[PDB]
Curated annotation (Swiss-Prot), chain A:
The chain holds residues 749 to 798 of 938 of the full protein. Belongs to the glutamate-gated ion channel (TC 1.A.10.1) family. NR1/GRIN1 subfamily. Glycans are attached at N23. Heterotetramer; the NMDAR subunits are modular and harbor tiered domains that function in concert to regulate opening and closing of the cation-selective ion channel pore. Forms heterotetrameric channels composed of two GluN1/zeta subunits (GRIN1), and two identical GluN2/epsilon subunits (GRIN2A, GRIN2B, GRIN2C or GRIN2D) or GluN3 subunits (GRIN3A or GRIN3B) (in vitro). Can also form heterotetrameric channels that contain at least two GluN1 subunits and at least two different GluN2 subunits (or a combination of one GluN2 and one GluN3 subunits) (in vitro). It is linked to Neurodevelopmental disorder with or without hyperkinetic movements and seizures, autosomal dominant: An autosomal dominant neurodevelopmental disorder characterized by severe intellectual disability and developmental delay, absent speech, muscular hypotonia, dyskinesia, and hyperkinetic movements. Cortical blindness, cerebral atrophy, and seizures are present in some patients. A hydrophobic region that gives rise to the prediction of a transmembrane span does not cross the membrane, but is part of a discontinuously helical region that dips into the membrane and is probably part of the pore and of the selectivity filter. It is found in: Cell membrane; Postsynaptic cell membrane; Postsynaptic density membrane; Synaptic cell membrane. This is Glutamate receptor ionotropic, NMDA 1. NMDA is probably regulated by C-terminal phosphorylation of an isoform of GRIN1 by PKC. Its phosphorylated state is influenced by the formation of the NMDAR-PPP2CB complex and the NMDAR channel activity. It comes from Homo sapiens.
UniProtKB/Swiss-Prot annotation, chain B:
It is linked to Neurodevelopmental disorder with or without hyperkinetic movements and seizures, autosomal dominant: An autosomal dominant neurodevelopmental disorder characterized by severe intellectual disability and developmental delay, absent speech, muscular hypotonia, dyskinesia, and hyperkinetic movements. Cortical blindness, cerebral atrophy, and seizures are present in some patients. The gene is GRIN1. It comes from Homo sapiens (Human). Component of N-methyl-D-aspartate (NMDA) receptors (NMDARs) that function as heterotetrameric, ligand-gated cation channels with high calcium permeability and voltage-dependent block by Mg(2+). NMDARs participate in synaptic plasticity for learning and memory formation by contributing to the long-term potentiation (LTP). Channel activation requires binding of the neurotransmitter L-glutamate to the GluN2 subunit, glycine or D-serine binding to the GluN1 subunit, plus membrane depolarization to eliminate channel inhibition by Mg(2+). Heterotetramer; the NMDAR subunits are modular and harbor tiered domains that function in concert to regulate opening and closing of the cation-selective ion channel pore. Forms heterotetrameric channels composed of two GluN1/zeta subunits (GRIN1), and two identical GluN2/epsilon subunits (GRIN2A, GRIN2B, GRIN2C or GRIN2D) or GluN3 subunits (GRIN3A or GRIN3B) (in vitro). Can also form heterotetrameric channels that contain at least two GluN1 subunits and at least two different GluN2 subunits (or a combination of one GluN2 and one GluN3 subunits) (in vitro). It is found in: Cell membrane; Postsynaptic cell membrane; Postsynaptic density membrane; Synaptic cell membrane. This is Glutamate receptor ionotropic, NMDA 1.
Swiss-Prot record, chain D:
The gene is GRIN2A. The chain holds residues 754 to 803 of 1464 of the full protein. Contains an N-terminal domain, a ligand-binding domain and a transmembrane domain. Agonist binding to the extracellular ligand-binding domains triggers channel gating. A hydrophobic region that gives rise to the prediction of a transmembrane span does not cross the membrane, but is part of a discontinuously helical region that dips into the membrane and is probably part of the pore and of the selectivity filter. It is linked to Epilepsy, focal, with speech disorder and with or without impaired intellectual development: An autosomal dominant, highly variable neurologic disorder. Features range from severe early-onset seizures associated with delayed psychomotor development, persistent speech difficulties, and intellectual disability to a more benign entity characterized by childhood onset of mild or asymptomatic seizures associated with transient speech difficulties followed by remission of seizures in adolescence and normal psychomotor development. It is found in: Cell projection, Dendritic spine; Cell membrane; Synapse; Postsynaptic cell membrane. Component of N-methyl-D-aspartate (NMDA) receptors (NMDARs) that function as heterotetrameric, ligand-gated cation channels with high calcium permeability and voltage-dependent block by Mg(2+). NMDARs participate in synaptic plasticity for learning and memory formation by contributing to the slow phase of excitatory postsynaptic current, long-term synaptic potentiation, and learning. Changing I19M: Unchanged function in ion transmembrane transport; unchanged agonist potency and unchanged channel activation by glutamate. Belongs to the glutamate-gated ion channel (TC 1.A.10.1) family. NR2A/GRIN2A subfamily.
Amino acid sequence: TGELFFRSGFGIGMRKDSPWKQNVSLSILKSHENGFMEDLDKTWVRYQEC
Amino acid sequence: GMMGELLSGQADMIVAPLTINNERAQYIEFSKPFKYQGLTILVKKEIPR
Amino acid sequence: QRAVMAVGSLTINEERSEVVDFSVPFVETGISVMVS
Amino acid sequence: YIFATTIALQKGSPWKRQIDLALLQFVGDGEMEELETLWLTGICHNE
């Protein structure tokens, strides 16, 4: 019921000296633009109704 | 938990649905996030008459 | 470098990220479809 | 239903951390929803 509250995002946790920022972010935007987000939205999220 | 296990050296990767916060970002940086979500409210279906 | 900062309602994308860095995303968007 | 889902800083700027902490505070203190009330809704959310 209702609207959302404290609208934020779910993401990856990494250390500041961890050099795995940028290429990981590249892969992430690839996942956002290539429908893999929608792929998981089908394969795990959108099936079920009462 | 998770944050102390990163800052303790025992854990090295968080890949799990964490929210984004000030104080968490003060020490451990996020990437750009997967899903843009938040809070909803569980209210039951009351039984019919 | 005519300007250091640029705000807009700027969409956040690959080729944009290739060149420049980004804030934690300000507001939420994507592709929608408008119909009657 | 949102399909093809999901601030410009030059690289190497010292400005990431400060602005991020700022914006996560502004998210964290509900003034974003005040902005929403100022600018977002017209008639449709009052369906």
